[PDB]
Amino acid sequence: CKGKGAKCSRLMYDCCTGSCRSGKC
Question: Which residues are reported to carry the modification Cysteine amide?
Answer without folding.
Answer: 25
